[PDB]
Design a protein around this ligand. Structure first.
Ligand SMILES: O=C(CO)[C@@H](O)[C@H](O)COP(=O)(O)O
Ligand SMILES: O=C(CO)[C@@H](O)[C@H](O)COP(=O)(O)O
Ligand SMILES: [Mn+2]
Ligand SMILES: [Mn+2]
Lengths: 209, 209
């Protein structure tokens, strides 16, 4: 069972608290959603402390379709409508400071441009190679997605409410499952937690955000 | 100089002919565009012979933003308008036969669904995790992009005019340059060629497609 495999990381409240602390230290975490949903684990990083080396690891070890989780307000500031009349907006590229936009450094530059609380729509070309996602108001208490988990995690840690995610992928191209996620987290010193963990945590610590 | 580094692979005409033969054998090739353009090398595969293991290699070794190069006609058949009023359409997912769409197998399933000459728009959900690109009519003699190179390569090899591409990426997240591309091609037995090679080839062999 998954709850028994995660015991190693502590009880649910500890798993949340350890994840929040890692984010405050500028490290990444591994977030699993429900087993009966996608049953996938994403690498999560805070935008505020995002480095080229973190982005390189995400590209190397995950699907490479690296997403920027934004508040509805920030996506509205950037004039990012849904890509289609998972809440993908149109993809984005920094208008300045990048070349082709695909390199790890370029993606970070685009992400920081987009997440800047003083950003303007002209700051971003469209389309590009970073994929923004709109988190639902209410976070994981409204939608149990990694998108909401990501932004909720940043808010609960006291950070700017923007993060990046990408799905952990096995070398043979299949999606990592809990055993593989646990091993990856130990290898890279990243705490593991679930959306369930965050839901119980927010409810019991009566935590509106 | 790049032309001297590629000499190992044969003269320009040989580099084209070797690439075409690899595609007919169901193997991949490495296509470089102009040094003063993106100066990037993409892994290219024919859709017709695409395997999960080929897709896994692309995700592992490239940006992970794996693109499906289509004729304008095929994109029109699928009712794929531009993602924005590089010719990205809206992203796509197979409507059937996939789970979350990100796994190597799922991407291949989506690609084969989209490239089927009998496909219908209802076959594809939007958005998704495969990114189609419209090749310009005229191919590399109209636009010197990897998008056109990909589709031109399939036509010249006598294959269905659909291929996939993705940008070769170094482990540190920078984009591979010619030395690294050459080494990768030797390691994985993939021929290397340039868009320039294909332009001279099409012009001299007076090759409309
Ligand atoms: O497919 C995607 C992003 O490409 C999303 O589904 C992410 O995989 C996680 O997003 P959630 O749906 O869990 O919020
Ligand atoms: O950025 C992209 C795809 O994400 C494209 O630019 C590809 O990198 C190659 O396409 P071309 O512009 O060379 O046709
Ligand atoms: Mn997810
Ligand atoms: Mn390119």
């Amino acid at each position: 069972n998954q709850s028994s495999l995660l015991a190693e990381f502590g009880d649910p409240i500890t798993r949340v608290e350890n994840a929040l602390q890692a984010l405050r230290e500028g490290r990444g975490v591994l977030l699993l959603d429900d087993e009966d949903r996608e049953n996938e684990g994403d690498i999560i990083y805070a935008v505020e402390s995002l480095t080229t080396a973190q982005m390189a690891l995400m590209i190397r070890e995950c699907s490479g379709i690296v997403c920027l989780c934004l508040t509805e307000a920030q996506a509205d500031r950037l004039a990012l409508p849904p890509m289609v009349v998972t809440a993908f907006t149109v993809s984005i590229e920094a208008k300045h400071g990048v070349t082709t936009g695909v390199s790890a450094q370029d993606r970070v530059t685009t992400i920081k441009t987009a997440a800047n609380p003083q950003a303007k729509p002209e700051d971003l070309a469209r389309p590009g190679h970073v994929f923004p996602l709109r988190a639902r108001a209410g976070g994981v208490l409204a939608r149990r997605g990694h998108t909401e988990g990501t932004v909720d995690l940043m808010q609960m840690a006291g950070l700017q409410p923007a993060g990046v995610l990408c799905e952990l992928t096995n070398p043979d191209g299949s999606m990592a499952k809990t055993p593989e996620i646990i091993e990856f987290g130990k290898l890279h010193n990243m705490p593991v937690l679930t959306i369930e963990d965050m839901v119980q945590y927010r409810i019991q610590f009566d935590l509106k955000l």
